[PDB]
Amino acid sequence: TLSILVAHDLQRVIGFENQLPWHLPNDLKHVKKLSTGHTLVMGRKTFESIGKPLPNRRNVVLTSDTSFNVEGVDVIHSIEDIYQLPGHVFIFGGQTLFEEMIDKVDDMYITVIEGKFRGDTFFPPYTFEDWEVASSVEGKLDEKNTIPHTFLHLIRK
């Protein structure tokens, strides 16, 4: 299965200055739960943002840099290489990867951040005419998690 994994706000902002615009520990827990034991594919900027491969899953980085050879990371140089990756593969970002893959994936695990943030990078527009809501779950709010959010699983119709 090939899936998108993304958190975006009410206006589809995903990032600002190579970081996330929000602090939301529960979304990181969600990412951990979904992708542990599986594969993440990310663009080079997203990788450099996170700084190191995420533990307990396969980290694959897409880059044109033929000098990229980082410990604990697999490298690919073409979108086409993604389709040769075994198992459950999650497209992990960023904007460029999401733009290249939204028409290709089977489903999407979206955390809708129910706020309006300043962004410089966006998830591409999409319509519920194309996507079935397999599940929609409101995130619980507390002292550490203060922004309303909804976990959506969308499956291509």
Ligand X SMILES: NC(=O)c1ccc[n+]([C@@H]2O[C@H](COP(=O)([O-])OP(=O)(O)OC[C@H]3O[C@@H](n4cnc5c(N)ncnc54)[C@H](OP(=O)(O)O)[C@@H]3O)[C@@H](O)[C@H]2O)c1
Ligand Y SMILES: COc1ccccc1-c1ccc2c(N)nc(N)nc2c1
Select from 2, 50, 73, 152 the one that contacts ligand Y (CB under 6 A).
Answer: 50
End-to-end CA distance of the chain: 15
For residue 147, count other CB atoms closer than 10 A to its CB.
16
Select from 2, 26, 28, 45 the one that contacts ligand X (CB under 6 A).
Answer: 45
Q: How many residues bind ligand X (CB under 6 A)?
A: 28
- Residue ranges for the known binding site for substrate are 5-6, 27, 49, 57, 92
Kindly state whether residue 96 participates in binding ligand X, applying the rule CB under 6 A: yes
Minimal CB distance residue for ligand Y: 7
Q: Which of 110, 92, 103, 111 is nearest to 45 (CA)?
A: 92
Kindly state whether residue 15 participates in binding ligand X, applying the rule CB under 6 A: yes
Shortest gap between Cβ of 101 and ligand Y (angstroms)?
A: 11
Kindly state whether residue 20 participates in binding ligand Y, applying the rule CB under 6 A: yes
Omega cis (within 30) before 94:
yes
CA-to-CA distance for 59 and 73, rounded, in angstroms? 5
CA-to-CA distance for 115 and 144, rounded, in angstroms? 16
Binding site for ligand X (CB under 6 A): 6-7, 14-15, 18-20, 42-46, 49, 62-65, 77-79, 92-97, 100, 121
